[model samples]
Each structure stands twice: as C-alpha cells, then as structure tokens.
Target: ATRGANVIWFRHGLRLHDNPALLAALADKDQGIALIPVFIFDGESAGTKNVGYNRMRFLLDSLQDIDDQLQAATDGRGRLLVFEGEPAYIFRRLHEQVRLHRICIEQDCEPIWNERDESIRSLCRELNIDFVEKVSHTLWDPQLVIETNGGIPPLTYQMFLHTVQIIGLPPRPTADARLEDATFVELDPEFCRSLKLFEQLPTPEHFNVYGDNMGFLAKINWRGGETQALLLLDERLKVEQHAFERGFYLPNQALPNIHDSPKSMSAHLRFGCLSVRRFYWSVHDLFKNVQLGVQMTGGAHITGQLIWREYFYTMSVNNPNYDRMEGNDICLSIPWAKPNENLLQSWRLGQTGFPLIDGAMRQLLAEGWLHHTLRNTVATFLTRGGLWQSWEHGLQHFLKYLLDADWSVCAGNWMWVSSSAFERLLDSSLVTCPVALAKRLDPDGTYIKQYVPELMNVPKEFVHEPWRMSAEQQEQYECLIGVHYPERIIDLSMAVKRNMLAMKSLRNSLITPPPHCRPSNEEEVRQFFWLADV
Candidate 1:
C-alpha cells in the first residue's frame, strides 16, 4: 500500500511546528506514503551569496537539532538526509534512484529562491513527480497582500497595516505536524554509500564560506533549534508580562543594556526556527487576556515589529531591485561618494574613533547583533550621516555581520536610514548625531566600554569622546587617541554640513515624470524621476 518516497525539503522553515509543508508530508503518510526529510547545502550555485560565520554556524546547529528531533520521532528509522551540492543535481540523482513520489517545500518569495524552486519544478515535471509547496514562512503571503492592495505593494507600513486588516489575521498557526506512528523512508544502503548520504554536516573549514570574517569566536550566545526558539518565546512572554506590572512595556534600545535584552527572538524568526504566526498569535492571545492597562501597552508595539517584517518581505517580493539603489522603485537616486576603502575598512574593524560607532561595530563583529536603535546609528554614519558612502556598501557590511540580516529587512532599513526609500519625505537633517545620541544614552559609556576595551580606564567625562581628552589626560588614562585607539575618521560636524548641501542639490534635481510617462511597471516606477548624476 506504500507509495514512493515523499521528501520534505528543509530550507528556511527549519522547525517542525506549524510547518504546512511538513504537515502535508505527514498527511501523505496517512495515505500510506513514506516521508524523507532532506536538506541541501547549496553554496556553489550562483544567485546565492555566502553567509557570515555565525550565520553558517547557526544554520548547521539548527539542522542537526531538526535531525535529532526527526530521528527520535521516527524511532531511529530516519534522519535529516543532508547533501552538499547544487540542489537540482541532487534532486535529479535522488529521483533517478528512489523515484520520489512528491517533493514538498515551504514557499520562498525571494527571487533567487524562486529561480531555484522553478528549476526543481522542471525536474519534477520531467520525472513525473509531484511538487507541493506551502506558504508558512511569513504571516501572510506577500502576493495576497499585494493583490489586496491592487497589483502594487503598500508603499508604507500604515498602508500595509490597513490592507492586512481587510484581509483578516493570517490563518491561525497550523496544528503540530504529527510524526509519531509515521513510516519514514528507509534508503538503500548501497545507494546511500554511492551518494555519500551518511556524511555529517560539513564543517566551516571544509566549506570555506567565511575565509577570515568568521567571528573571532565560533559560539554565539544564541543556541539554534526549534526547542530553543520555543523556550525563548515563552521566556520573552514572561518578561513582557512582568513588564506590564511596571506600568509600561516600552523597550529602550538606545541604552547599551539592549545587548542582553530579551528582544533576542529575531535571529530565530529570521531563520524560521520559530513560526512567524506562532509568535504573532501568542502575543495576540496575551494581548486579549492582559489587563486594560496592558491593552494600551507593549502588545501593539511588539506586534508592530512583526508587521514591519512583513512590510519588507512584501517589498522584496514585489520589487526586483529591493536590495540595491538603482531601479529600486522606492529608493531615491542619491549622489553618494565613491567607496573609500580606508573609511569603510576602519568602520568595519570598529576603529572609526567614535566610541558609540566603534562599540556598536565591535559588538556586531563579535556577536552578530545590535539593538535596533544602534543599527540605525551605525547605518546612518556609514552612509549619508558621516562617510557619505552609498547605502549598498553599508548593506553588504551588515550582511557580513548581522545575525538577523534578512535580505528584505536589511535592504529596507538601509534605504530608510539613508532617506533613500521610505523617508523620501524627510531629508538630510535626518542624520543621527552619532556622538550626541550615544552620549545621551550611555552617559557613563558602560555599553561602549564593554565592547570597546581601549577606553576602559578613560574618565567618565571622556568615555563618549575619548579624543576630547588633552595630552595630559590621555597620558593619565593610558589611552592615547592616535596610538591606543584611532583618531576620528571624519569631523562629523563638517561632514554633515557638506553632505547636507549635497543632499539639497540632489533633491533639486529629482525631476518628476510627465503625465504621459506613468509608472507602467516596477522598473518604470523606480525610474519615474529624471535621475541626473551629481
């Protein structure tokens, strides 16, 4: 009665809870089909970029955890079958041998993923196999939201929120995918030997994904897995509950204590270790039951963060140039300065000579994280605020370091901070004053001292601005501005003044299109204005 093997291919949705594709495969088992869970480590393929060391480590750990859970559920009958190669070649080889019945996956709307999935679909059609894809990654299918908004994605978060309300909350998180009493596919030993299926997950050294950018340390504070994700969710909810007792649940990310803050669920959410819907409804349930005072507190703020994630995902799916400047419909054509290797390199190494910027960058390098506010500060300085560099350069730097650096979210934030996309209404004065902002938040520079050890002994007065110390003060503190740390890279005030003038000139030149020239398509939408080079 058993049908040929059905594979639940693991990609971003790394957990078993509320996974539609996994549930679909489980349902197939009820119909007498055998389930085979597979993960393909695809690095050699084009169109996909490499990840940071911590990012790679988190994924490998997550995969192993899934396999461990999978093995237990099947009573040791099966495990996550991992293969390192181009996905198409592996699937072709798999079908040639096992004659796969159905291949199921969570839908990914990113362009590269779309291309990869299409290739697999072609292979499935050629071999007469079934392809089942489920939308479980985001709260709502981006397409659904776009369709609700009439062919175009909502331009702002407010518009997106209104559109989704009309559509109603996303289908409640799906039931747990039942796996006990399931028949897992057993591979032929000789065939497994031939394909090297028994191999372990490849080590970073073997993969060479991160040459030197591998974090100075391998282990992050975060442990990756569905189990850990769930634990963190419960812990975060408890924190929020207690927060209600204090009269307000507002999270202050400007302070450095944000490093240890409970807002750490983002990495899990980014990798799909936690279900987006599960997070949404859990908070929603809390919102409904909490006291009246709680109703007006953190519930809406927490939910708003999730909606922002969806907003960026919608933009990414609908716009091909969402990640770059040119042809990016929402992004303005700013005349950014040419790349300065010295400036960029110093910024990356946390030697920018500004305590807050250096501290944030150092934390990012070591931990692959930063508070949302800190992310804004550094991003601003790197682009329009200080360096006068392009937003894309800053985006790439973030991708190399941030653990939560989802393609859409990072691109959207970079555009926003640079006033290139969402903040078209706001102009150059929007520059976040790095020194002043950090000084206000960390008056004693506790957070800065934690990440940046060079100024640990500096007096409290000079903690935020070590360069302000006179020669005698520097000698007393044993922290020479030029010798021990670094001199200020750019005079922030003058740089802002110059950049502001350039911004005004660029704004003057952004000529609108004629009535005859309407945005006929996505590309045309971005190019609607005459973008003369400065």
Candidate 2:
C-alpha cells in the first residue's frame, strides 16, 4: 500500500463514470492507498443566487449517488468527504491532516470559479502538492476552437455553431476504469455524517410530470454524481427515437411539437449532474444506428446549444471584466432613477396588469424558469417600460429564481435585450420594445392566458389589450381593465417611441465613426440575431 494520499476534488462535474480527473487519478495509482473524494459546498463562493433550489436539489441527489458508488467501488472502504467552507480553508484542513500528494479536479470556466481555482492552485504551490485541472465538462475547449478570423467568436450561438461545425468536435473519451482495488479510509462514518451535509438539502422535484419515471430522469434521478450521469445517458438514448418522434427536437426553427408536458432537464444539465458529452454521444449513436428518418440536425442543434453553454463560459473566462462593466457606456454617464421597490415588487409579483407581461412574470415565480422567449419579453418590459430600471436589476431578479440560471449567459442576454450591448456594437440608433415582442411571439396571447388567469375572464381578442376593450364588453366580462386588472403600467407605444428617440440621440452624438463602426464580434452578432426584433 502506498503511504501517500490522493484526493479527487469534485466540483461542477458531479458524475462518476465519465469524469476524466477522477478516472486519471485512479488509473495511475494502484497502491491500495487512501482515496478521498471531496465536495465542498462553498455558499459564498458559489454565488448563491445563481445556484437556486432546483439546481441545489439536483446536486444533492448526484452527491448521494456518487457516495454510494464510491463505497461500492472499494468494498465499503472509500468515503466521499462532504464539506461546507471556503475552498482555500477546506484544502488547508485536508493538507494539515495528510501527506497529500495530488489534488485532481475538473476545470470550471466561469470567471468567479476561475479565480477560485487560481487561489487554490497558489495554496497547492505553497503546500508543495500537485494541483491538476482538466477540461471535461465542456465538449469543446473554448481555447482550442477559433473563428475564420483566428479569434474567439463573439458571444453568439449561431457563430458558435458555425465554428463548431467547421472545427468538428473531438470524439468522446472512453469511460474511466472502475476503481476496484484501491484501499479506502475507514473513518468514523458518523464523524463526517455530523457535518449535516444533507440535513437541510432541498428535495428534487420531478419536472417531467408525466412519463412513467418522469421523462429522461427515469434511469438516474439522483443528485449530481458520475454513475447517475452515465445511467441517465443510457435511459435517454434507449428511447431516443421515441423521444424524437414525440417531439424532443433540438431548439431551432422547427415549431416544437408539444409533448405531454415540459421536461425540465435543463437544471440538471446546468448543474453538471448530467454530462453534456454523455448526452451528445447517446444522441449521436442513436442518429447513426437508428434507421428512422429523424433529422440529426435537431440533435446537432441541441448539441450546438450545449456548445453555447461552453461559449458563455469561454467568454466569461476571456473577458473577466465584462460581468461588472456597464452594458452602455453612455447610459452609465446619464443619471438613471434608483430602484423603485414598490413598482419593482409589483412587476416581480405579476401585478403589472399587462396580461402577457404579468403572466410571464408569474410563470417565472411559480416554475423557477421561464421560456427563453418569455424571459426576453418580460426582461425588456421591466428595463424599458415597467420600471425603466437597468438590465442588471432584471438579471438579478432572474438569477434569484431561474433553475438554469448561468451568470455569463443571463448577464449577456439581459444587456442584449436592453439594446445596450447591441447598439454599442452596431453603432446604430435602434431600440426594442417588450410590447412589440409580445405581439410577435405570443400573437394570439395563448401563452399570456396560460400563465395569467386573472385575465381569463377577458376576451381572447381583448386579452393583449384589456384597456382597449369597450366599457360594454368589460362590464359583460365583469373585468374593467384599469380597475379589475391593472392598466398598462406605461403606454407601450409611447415607451417604444421614447426609447427609439433616446437611442438615435445617443448615436447622433458619436461623430468620430460611421454607424457599425466596430465590426460586430461573434457574441454581439449572435445575440443581435436572436434579440433584434425583441
């Protein structure tokens, strides 16, 4: 038995079977030495708002499952060390107790996590121990992929997809070997148990309300661990054709066929309880082997979204300063009103009285997620009209509850919707209004009706504009637009015109360069396409 100890530090990459770092450490060391797998729940470092209850629930389950798998691997010898402290402090304690030789962990690309890793690496250097970081979470390393111009593409998904298509993703790595022969440390199980790691943990709710075992989660619905991740892949692909036929088409132009109910696997994917590689491989294999004429483009599109996930991470890593920077340099100079707590609360609680806007906000509160289309619409409404607040405020609100909330993506998206970043790139005078978007995306107001039931009594034709209804009709429906439901918080048409004028004035002031002065980066260009009309 080797005297040295090796610790596998599990972070976002929670799963077991496909984890590169864990497998690499296990493969090189066969000395029947002490193997400790540790997960540190750093509340302050994790950015609490970004990690909401849904993700927390998913993570807890993955950890429990991982612990079970680790114990089984060494005949009940291995132990999963769960901790709740700052990463530096946690590592220092581990170093104090053992002659730690190496610390292996999956690399994280978010700006905050990047900083955290750097701090930990410095500690490892000081302690004279090896710190190894590997990129296994993302299918393509953001550093490896480059655009035609030989730079990281701007933060746009289409540009990202184009680059991905041109570069071609690397093949998936083989599964890691099972750790069968390693000797595990037998500490007082109750000693670690006393930490109460799982005591206050939230329960995982089934997002797939229908399906036998609730959609793709049938195989492994446990928290974020490696074994559970692999099992999930097997279950999802086993019925890939069925899933496709039943309308799990990738997020693209094709009108999504309505399934029995919405499946909220996004939270799992966001938290790393599920591996993107496992998903891509499963769908890819199914596409090739299955004779069914299912368009693989849909699968490719879904994978493309996952690539965008990496793109956001890459952008955050490369542009660490972007997160805290104001979206519009000009706007920052202009004195903006402070947050109106009462008005903001009304918008947050879905009382803005614009049926569609109110409904959308309510959906977010109730479900901890909003459709991408709805998020843009409601966010625009809040920033441009409802409260005339900064996009940062809206981004904060979304992060507070969004199940799949990612900081880079959410911040980038909010700025794009407010026309803050897009106008800066295009160097043009154009502004987007939430009402215009609501009309286009929910033309018939079907989504509005679904989420906001107070307006249910309002006529379908008058739902979008309850204030426009005749007094006779309002009386018949027992709903007065201004009294029964709140009237339009601000005149939608006027708000759009005012915003447009403001943008034009800002653009006209810049005399040094032509409009579109700066060539739009990939991220700016891509966001422009998705959010242009909205």
Candidate 3:
C-alpha cells in the first residue's frame, strides 16, 4: 500500500473555497502525509451513457479551469490528477499503485452516488485506509433531514419546510482551503508510466453532439469555471439588489418562480465549481441587507427557491425510484400513454406547431436554457395534461438538452408537471395559450421570433396564433402558416382540458401516506412549509 498519501476525492465540491472535505484534509495532514486531489470522469461507457453533450462540454471546460486554479494556488506543486474510469475500480487500482492512507470526500445523496460511496468505503476498510466524509453540497444534509422528520421524507413542500424549521439553521461554512497548505503529493514516475492514465477529457466525437448544429447554446454566455461562476453570482446578486432597492424585486421570485428565473447559478453548483453555501450565504446577505427598504416584499423571497432546491434533494435521497412514475410509490399512479416517437421527436426538435411551445423547444436546442416559466410551460404542454405523451419522453429530452439539468431538481420537477407528482387543470387560464402569458416572459416575442424566424414578420398581436391570419393577411405578414410554419398539431383547449381532467383522475390512484407518515396533532409543525394551491 502507498503509505504516506491522503487523497481528496473530488466529486461535486470542486472549489478551493469553503470546501469542507478539502479543508479538513489540509488541517488533518499533521502526520506529514502527502496530499493528492483527484477528479474522476466515468468514461467507462465510451460515450454510450446518453448524457447531454453540452453539459459534457461544460464539465470538461470546468475541469480544465479547476486544474489551472489548483496549479496556481499550489505555486506549481499542486495539480489535479484526472482519471477516466469507473470510480470504484479506479480507486481500487490506485490503491495498489499509490499506497494511499486516507480518502476525503464530500457526501453525496443521490442513490447511484450513495452506492458508489459505499463500495469505496468498503474497499477503504479492506485496504486499512481511513475514509472521511463531510457534507456542504446543500443547506441541509439529505439523510439527516429525513431523519429529523421521523425517518420519512416530506411528502409535500410544506412538510419539508416544517421539518427544516425544526432543524433550524445550518452551520456556518468553513473558510476557503488555503493553497499554500495544500499537500503536494507526487506520483512515482514508475507508477505514472506503468499505468499511464490521467487528465483525458471528453472530445466532440466522444460526446458526438458538438457539431455546427449545436446553435444558440453554442453562443451561450455562461462559461464553465470557478472564476466565471463567481462573476455571474456577483452580477446576478448586484442586479437583484439594485432592482429590490427600487422596490422592484425579481418579477416572480417565488418558490416555484413559475414566472421567474433562478439566481442563474445551477451549472456552477452542478459541477461543484461553485460552493453552494457561499451562494446561499451571499444571496442571504444580499436579501437581508435589502430588508430595511423593501416596501412590498419579504425581502428574501429568493431564499424560498434555495429551500425549494433542498426540498427536492430530500425527495431524491428518500425516494430511490424518484426518476420514473412506474413502480415509484411517491410518483402519482396515473395512466400515461407511451411516448409517440413522432410526437416526441417533433416536441424535441421545435417542430411542435404552438408558437411558444416550439419556440421554447428550439431555444433549448439552440441555447441549452429557457427562462424559468418557459420550462414549466413547455413541460406542462408535453406530459399527460399537455401532449398526452409519456413524461419519460420529455424527461429524456431535457436530460439531453438543458445545460443545468440536475437530476435532483429534474426528477422532482418532471413528476410535478407530469401529473405524477404535482398539479394541473382547466379554466382556460390554467393552460392558457402561450401568447397571452408569453408576453409576460417574452414581451416583444424576441425569443419566439428568433427561434421561429418564419414568424419574424408576423405582428406581436398575431404572433402566437399566426394560423388565425387570413391568406391575404399571411401574404401581408409574409409568413404563411402551414408553409412557413407548421400548423398547430394540438389545440390549446384540446390539449390542456384533457390534461386537467386526466390529472384530476389521479385522485383515484393517489397513494395514501403510510400510517406513520405524519406526526400526531400534539407534534404540530414548527414553521413547517406548505404549498398554497396553484
């Protein structure tokens, strides 16, 4: 066994600042053990896992940036040791070659991650290496949060809030790890040569989706890297601060923010390129400071979004089968048709005829993102209530396109919109045509027109319902409905009314919480959260 080395196994916590695992390892290096920080890319699939290419690209760039920062921090002594393989096997092989004595890791709540960690932990026991874990990814530890709530994950967002209310504040984050104190472990030249595997990043052919066709997303402004993450956070917080100062906080900065954007710091959080605590604290500080002046808001409504993110983490960790409706107890037992390939393909390709629907689809294809409301609107249009297709179809599309598609959030959000976890309904207002509401999100229809150029000449008044235009009107607008743009495949009412009814039907199949699901009356919730009907 390699005797004197301590390894910081980088997973989601990728930064030097406020990283508990990294900081702890540095502080614990009292025995003069050499420290090695390593990141592993599970390339065992050889590009066959069906992961998103754009996200892969972001990950590669971020890894490069992290390594650069590490190098500079350690004054050339510390450099990232990147490896490509199945993590358990990679660590097993490294054990035989490097003689590591300790492994430091940030605890992960995802099931696959939990399985991997368990395997590694078991291996550490056999190898006589100490395995250390610290949690800093989310505000509350997923496991503990469940434990705090009578060993059950909150069934509703309000229940989640109540449980967390009992848990109270999370501990303050630790200081950023100092590069000067980073252990500089050097691999033996013979071992480095004999095994000869490190720093191999994914390429275009590896991901197979980086061609010229990768449009607007290709020009997306968000770049991967710790530096870029810090800059965007600073920029967003400042803008939010300025807006709140004028008593105009983010237009729809509520929990679901069904009509607003997030702080726009997802990918950074996904890759651990940015610290979650740092972000939470930054926004909290900003939101707190803005308190004295807000005339009409809670001053910290964005904090609700952060709590919402944690709420999903609890859902993810507690429910191993969180991804699919079938066999998932937490998933509402609703009958959904299998995804029609043609329907699914059209929806994914921006070939869907509804103006905002197609516009949202194409924007994602071109830019890897959509404003927050567009995400829910487009999703609502696809599942049982909307397209009547299976939720799985839409879920896969997002897994392939969205730049910040974190599974914890996606699984929860998808089920909610899919009539398998959340809500839906009639009242033309519920599934209201996109044009009217589209104005709220895309007032000038700049996003809609740009993606569906055929609508460039159509008036904003007739923009979303161009099929309403007469032949003469079409000639005047120079954008023929059927020729220039596809006809609406599913009408607004036909799609959503059925959606609302189908969702309403789920009341029959609703799974009753187990007898132990809720506490007795005397155990009343302490500031427990709840969702007011949408």
- Taken over the whole model, the C-alpha lDDT of each candidate is 0.75, 0.61, 0.68
User: For candidate 3, lDDT tens digit of each residue in 272-316?
Assistant: 777777777887765665455645443355566677778777777
Reference-based TM-score of each model: 0.90, 0.77, 0.87
Question: Which prediction has the highest lDDT against the true structure?
Answer: 1
lDDT per residue as tens, model 1, 1-534: 325778899888989998999887777675677888988777622112646777777777788889999888878877899877778888888776666888999988776477788899998899888899998889998899999998878766667888999999887799987788777766667877666574677765666656345335533766777888999999888876776667654343223344465358787888789999999889888867654762475466577779888987887786777888787767777788888998999988888999899888888887788877688778878887788889898888787677778888888778756754223322343335767767665777888898889899998889988888899999999999889989999987888788777877776676652111012333322221111111
For model 1, name the residue pairs that clash.
Answer: none
What value does the lDDT take at residue 38 in candidate 2? 83
lDDT score, residue 533, model 2? Answer: 30
What is candidate 2's lDDT per residue for 1-534, written digit by digit as tens? 226677788877766756788876675466644667888767633344354444455566767777888777778777677777677876776566566778888877766677678888999999987898777777777676643416654444455566767777655855864777775454444644644334333343322122111111222223344554556566555555665766665433343221113444565566666777777776776676654575443354555556656666655556565454354322222223477887787778787877767877766665566666567557767764345666667877777666667776676666555644224432222223444555655767677777766667776677777877788998888788777788766665676556555556655665443221121464544343354432
TM-score-superior candidate, 1 or 2: 1
In model 3, where do residues sit more than 4 Å from their true spots? 1-3, 44-48, 188-190, 193-196, 199-204, 207-209, 212-217, 249-263, 287-299, 420-429, 508-534
Better of 2 and 3 by TM-score: 3
